[PDB]
């Protein structure tokens, strides 16, 4: 199947350079374009340009002429987006998307890479349990969760039981506090009967600070 897998989130200082990758698989790499699209937080999608891997030629929209470059490693079926002289306006998610030139459209997209431009140093989160709301002997539904506190920048990932628990999970948008750091909770509702017989673990990953935590949430 066609797949485009982008590199992980990046924190960079103003004036620095970042290079984002997009590993393509499942098709003849050189026969389709690679487009790059910007999405600043809460904003609409913006087409930046594309590179033609068959000829090596790049084409940019007017806003993206100058500090932006597209590169290819054809042997590795990988496309790159490089941004020089980073500015705060550059903080956004960047998507690669395959261009199917037979209809002039982008068909398959990557998952996006978040780039934060900032003078501040990364800060990893503290993870705390939100303990099950009821006991195993009572009825109905219990909620439990994990509070992911005080980190910078976005994003963190949260999964439950290594991805095996998906149903009933709500991971809230991050919110800033007056310290200038983010926090969020992830919660899940489960049958309270299963509290004495099932373990619940939240797996938190903050890539910019290299923090990976697994927190057992017990009643």
């Amino acid at each position: 199947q066609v797949q485009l897998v982008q590199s992980g989130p990046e924190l960079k200082k103003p004036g620095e350079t970042v290079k984002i990758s997009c590993k393509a698989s499942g098709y003849m790499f050189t026969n389709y374009g690679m487009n790059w699209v910007k999405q600043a937080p809460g904003k609409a999608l913006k087409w930046m340009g594309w590179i033609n891997p068959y000829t090596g030629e790049s084409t940019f929209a007017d806003d993206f002429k100058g500090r932006f470059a597209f590169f290819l490693e054809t042997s590795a079926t990988t496309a790159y987006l490089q941004i020089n002289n980073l500015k705060n306006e550059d903080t956004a998610t960047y998507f690669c998307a395959r261009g199917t030139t037979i209809v002039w459209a982008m068909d398959y997209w990557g998952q996006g890479t978040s780039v934060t431009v900032s003078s501040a140093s990364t800060k990893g989160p503290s993870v705390f349990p939100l303990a099950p709301s009821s006991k195993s002997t009572s009825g109905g539904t219990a909620a439990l969760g994990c509070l992911v506190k005080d980190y910078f920048p976005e994003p963190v990932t949260v999964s439950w039981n290594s991805g095996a628990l998906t149903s009933g999970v709500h991971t809230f948008p991050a919110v800033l506090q007056s310290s200038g750091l983010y926090s969020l909770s992830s919660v899940v509702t489960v049958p309270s009967s299963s509290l004495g017989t099932q373990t619940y673990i939240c797996n938190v990953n903050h890539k910019p600070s290299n923090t990976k935590v697994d927190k057992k949430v017990e009643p």
Binding site: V37, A44, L45, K46, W47, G49, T59, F60, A61, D62, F95, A97, V103, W104, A105, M106, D107, Y108, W109, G110, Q111, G112, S126, F128, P129, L130, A131, S133, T141, A143, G145, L147, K149, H170, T171, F172, P173, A174, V175, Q177, S183, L184, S185, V187, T189
Partner: protein
Amino acid sequence: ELVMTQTPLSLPVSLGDQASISCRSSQSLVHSNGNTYLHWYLQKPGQSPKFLIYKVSNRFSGVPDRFSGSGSGTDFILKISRVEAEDLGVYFCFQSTHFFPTFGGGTKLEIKRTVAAPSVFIFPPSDEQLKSGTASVVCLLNNFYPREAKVQWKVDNALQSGNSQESVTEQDSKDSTYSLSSTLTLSKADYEKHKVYACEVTHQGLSSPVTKSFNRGE
């Protein structure tokens, strides 16, 4: 550069109803070669955009027949008949007829459904957190509609102002409801000065407010 204008910016629609989203260009999207390179994408909350329609009216592989595109020249329409909960998200038109390709501004499709009451839960601070010097008390409102809800914090029966933060999820893909967290953050010192912690929730699905609380150390 041509301008793509999408209207409305937000579209509320009931399940089973038809949604119509308009895309208008300042210049004709018909290429000298006879083709019209106007496409549509949907980006659901949290996700990559997904290809929906190419060249005005053609559904991409796997897109349901309830999605259809029409229009010509400068005016285009995406219609979603029989709207479903999973159709939630932001729809974008995109032209590549003229250099350089451009997206419209997006239309957020919102689902209207019946009022639904929150289930409410409260969580004390963990001992792990307390030993670090802070206390966060978390109030969860789960699976309610509409989005408007009032959450008030009371500490030993005193209403609290300014020490809490709320976060709301996007509408759920399956049942179109919201969930909300309200977090009260105190120093461990202040937390330990008081016994009863409560959050009181007012919502149109509730005939009177619901309070959840706990006594600390209990």
